[PDB]
Amino acid sequence: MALRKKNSLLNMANSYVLDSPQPSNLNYFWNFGSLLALCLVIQLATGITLAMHYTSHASLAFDSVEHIMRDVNFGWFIRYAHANTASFFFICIYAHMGRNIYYGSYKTPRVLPWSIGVIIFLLLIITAFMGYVLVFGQMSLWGATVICNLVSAIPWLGEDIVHFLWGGFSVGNPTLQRFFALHYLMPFVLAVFALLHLIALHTAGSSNPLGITSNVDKLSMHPYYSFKDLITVFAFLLMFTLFVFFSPDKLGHPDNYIPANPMVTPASIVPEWYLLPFYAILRAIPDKLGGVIAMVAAILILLILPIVDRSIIRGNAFKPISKLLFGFFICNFLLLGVLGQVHIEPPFIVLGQICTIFYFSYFLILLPMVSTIENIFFYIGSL
Amino acid sequence: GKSTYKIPDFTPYLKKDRNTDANRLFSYFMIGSFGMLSAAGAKATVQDFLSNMSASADVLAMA
Amino acid sequence: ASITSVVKTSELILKSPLLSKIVVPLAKTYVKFSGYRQLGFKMNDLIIEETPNMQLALRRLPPTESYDRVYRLIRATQFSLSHKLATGNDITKPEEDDHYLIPYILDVEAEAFEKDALDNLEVV
Amino acid sequence: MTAAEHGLHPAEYPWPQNGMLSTFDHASLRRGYQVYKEVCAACHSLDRIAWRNLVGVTHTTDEAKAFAEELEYDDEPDDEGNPRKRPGKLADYIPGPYPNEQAARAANQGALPPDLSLIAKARHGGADYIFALLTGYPDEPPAGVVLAPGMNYNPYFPGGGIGMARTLFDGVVEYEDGTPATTSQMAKDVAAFLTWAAEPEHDERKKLGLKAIIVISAMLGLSVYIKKFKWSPIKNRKFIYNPP
Amino acid sequence: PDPAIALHEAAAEGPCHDFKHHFDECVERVTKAQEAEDYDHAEYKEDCVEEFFHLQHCINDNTADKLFRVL
Amino acid sequence: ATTFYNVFVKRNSAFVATILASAFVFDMTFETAIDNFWDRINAGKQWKDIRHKY
Amino acid sequence: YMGWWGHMGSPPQKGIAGYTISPFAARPFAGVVHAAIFNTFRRTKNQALFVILPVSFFYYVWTQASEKNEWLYTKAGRHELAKAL
């Protein structure tokens, strides 16, 4: 017996990266998983390095980031790589989740990897939110203030919880130092959950774009998907290069180059772009607690896709109506993103409410109805 | 269609010089070039990146 | 949804003259735009198989049907990875798109649902 | 929001540094330092820039040492623990005009002139905003605009009323390289200098980016060949089925 | 002198004449309205910021490149 | 082609040695070539171009 | 629902003969020009409507909303803005 199979440690690596039996027809949308692993590796390498030069104390934090930019050899690169890769991480994660929804990757027997995946997504949001605060610029401070004040909506104990989270009566030094410690930790937790969702997946194997079994026709992960992953790695690195070296501040907010000032409020307080759709959903509900619930529900509702999809067929490749509905759902999600950064003004207030209703009605009404009707059309249409 | 001894048509893909050393060498030139740029890229990346740990400009100014 | 429910609802529609008059033409267009026939699939090849019930139904297929299904799946997988469509005899014609699996899964489910009912019987 | 509340958006000027392959014009950087030193430095600090940062960018080692040595900085206490001053060194940061915010605001009718070290990154528009703002004071505010006391009309500034008056007038600086010091010339130079101050890695970054682009593109091309090479047995696979 | 002065004047009389004229017409109206009594006790006081913005935006589009060419 | 294959490619030890030596050469020559190209497209603008005045 | 090599969980396979050729024997870019033009065109044409319809709808909606918002905050839009608030 080959050593890679005989030795228990080598055999674990073997089972995931080499002999792992894959469908022979995975398309390029199956490459986002390895891009997410790449983003995670970049964030760990750059993040640990930034931590060697960063000071978490509020009197020194912003200045330590300027020290990184100006004095540390290649500090500018490490900082810009870390900041831009956070954005790329969300592009890849949305693409990965989009793939999963389009191709029915959430259906049995893959409910568990999908459900762990939803938690990974929440952990990424928390990770990125805390990392953004560490700069301690104007957007850092005011973003932290507004977002942490949402916890005040928890009935009875909310206010007490906020003061507990802050370690004081407003966002300050105690908050920054604890966000540093937790920002360092959370990526390790995220790596563990990423590993867990892959172990859960390994019982059924990868799905494929046709939605059928691949047990009939398997291909080794290596060399086929190893070399196919390299193409998207280099495409990713080209995109990375264009942002990091030629336009490093395109995705950021200029106000985060102003040191945090609790007195002066910035003109507009918006989250980073990748949180904007959830911010639009929150704004749509007039009630404070209502808004918070809706915002959380917008993510947790992903957990019910296995139930509300009533199709007897996995994925959308052969479902014209479900493909149209998916297209509208995705574009609506992008419009929500845009509406998250407009001013609270007519006519965007009502538009945000309509888009929020559409977002939820996809899960609760449209997908159950469309999937039921398509079942009937497949049966009658082929009689 | 029925006989399995009649190999399907591979003429659109087959190279005439498939057994020659020149044929193999070409593909190893591509593999080798890719390995070469990956080695050069890794070296550049490692060197630039790890230099963050050497004395920063403010430290060298006080020396 | 169970195959049983899909088949029952479809039969309610086919019974109703008015309903069938509207639904049957739509269903036939849907199937044409679905385009699974362009990869040489039959409709039943697309049904999710990773359930106990469906695994049992597949085991009950006659060997010939079973061997032919395997070939259609492998052939479709090859079209998928090559980004090609079936041509000529590989395209499933409407008359070839037979419900080979439906009777087997309906029997499996009939027993499974009877079992669930009888597990909840109350002696009167 | 009203356009006035946003501020007029600055034109896109063709900066020498615009362009994937373009550095700053270092002659413009040097002239812009001189504008900073003779005009802006009366009210604005440049606290993140040390004398050493100018060296090999705008000035020689000796010129920058001369600038540092003209100033006095706080030394360590003497042997009786009394305060002392020393001459400046290359390691020292350029000193600001005011000891604290309160002194800064008192000298500027309540307004606080920001530190200019990051101002090119801290405002939408960057160099274009700085250039537009400095050159965009109309002689007369548009009819109907009511300025608050100590405010000046400038359409580029959000709200229109800025606490900074116009400061650049033809010939307020005499450039040491003989360049005519017009309002426009000085604004262009100082905007370039401040852009450099915000991103001093700019020139090196773009050159390394060129190298990365080339290597990564070549690797992308080769990875396509290698993928296709390895995958061809799968892509080329043919079947003959004889139903049993 | 400042090259901008001439370039801006030329652009206002030429390609941006319609906007120049809107600004002018606005100014006339507003000044006249300020001249009239009980202006201070009016609900709505018109300004000419909007027209000014349209004019300046136009001048900038026709001048930016020309100006930087002579610096 | 046979000769080239036999010497530099056939043994992986030799192939890897050749790749690494080529990477070394590439790295040094590419550096020099980019430096010169960068200086030509940005002629007159860099410190090295105005240094002589001071 | 998945085994491993040798017992993957396939129904029994029989009667299929599979053929292929070595990567060294094949032209990896055979028919690349035809694929790049004709295959891509076919592939894109068949999916075009599923992208065009939602993109064009949501872009139209955005365009109308952003234009109205802009107009409401001009002098001319004063009265309509007062009602809208």
Ligand code: HEC
């Ligand atoms: C004697 C006073 C004074 C001089 C001289 C001066 N400034 Fe200022 N500047 C200010 C004050 C006060 C503010 C704050 C204005 C406000 O916030 O209302 C300011 C604000 C600015 C801003 C930021 C405007 C904003 O968006 O917040 C920039 C950029 C600026 N100055 C640059 C310069 C440059 C470049 C020069 C000269 C070459 C210059 N200043 C000369 C007093 C001055």
Ligand code: HEM
């Ligand atoms: C999933 C992984 C991670 C994500 C998404 C992430 C995200 C972010 C973000 C968005 C910022 C703000 C960047 C900026 O605008 O300057 C940031 C800053 C930071 N992160 Fe992370 N990060 C991750 C992992 C890590 C890790 C493992 C460390 C290890 C300590 C770390 C350390 C830092 C530090 C020190 C900063 C502040 C300095 C700076 O702003 O660059 N990060 N992170």
Ligand code: HEM
């Ligand atoms: C750190 C973030 C993540 C990493 C590194 C990661 C990595 C991967 C990898 C490598 C795969 C197998 C290859 C592939 O299909 O792309 C995979 C599959 C999957 N992931 Fe993720 N993932 C992450 C986040 C998520 C999230 C947020 C979700 C869901 C909300 C998710 C759900 C899934 C599912 C359902 C599959 C199986 C898809 C299939 O093959 O059919 N993952 N992931």
Ligand SMILES: CCCCCCCCCCCCO[C@@H]1O[C@H](CO)[C@@H](O[C@H]2O[C@H](CO)[C@@H](O)[C@H](O)[C@H]2O)[C@H](O)[C@H]1O
């Ligand atoms: C992704 C990075 C690579 C590192 C590997 C990831 C670490 C996770 C591995 C620990 C989880 C246990 O992983 C488990 O290992 C065993 C053997 O190793 C696999 O077992 C599989 O392969 C072996 C032979 O390769 C067969 O005996 C077995 O029939 C098959 O199911 C499981 O399918 C996998 O779920």
Ligand SMILES: CCCCCCCCCCCCO[C@@H]1O[C@H](CO)[C@@H](O[C@H]2O[C@H](CO)[C@@H](O)[C@H](O)[C@H]2O)[C@H](O)[C@H]1O
């Ligand atoms: C196992 C790996 C072995 C150990 C790894 C070694 C780590 C440190 C190696 C050297 C790092 C510093 O080495 C130094 O790198 C920098 C770039 O990074 C080079 O610097 C060169 O490029 C940079 C920008 O890329 C320019 O600002 C500089 O003017 C130029 O000289 C130096 O010429 C080299 O002397």
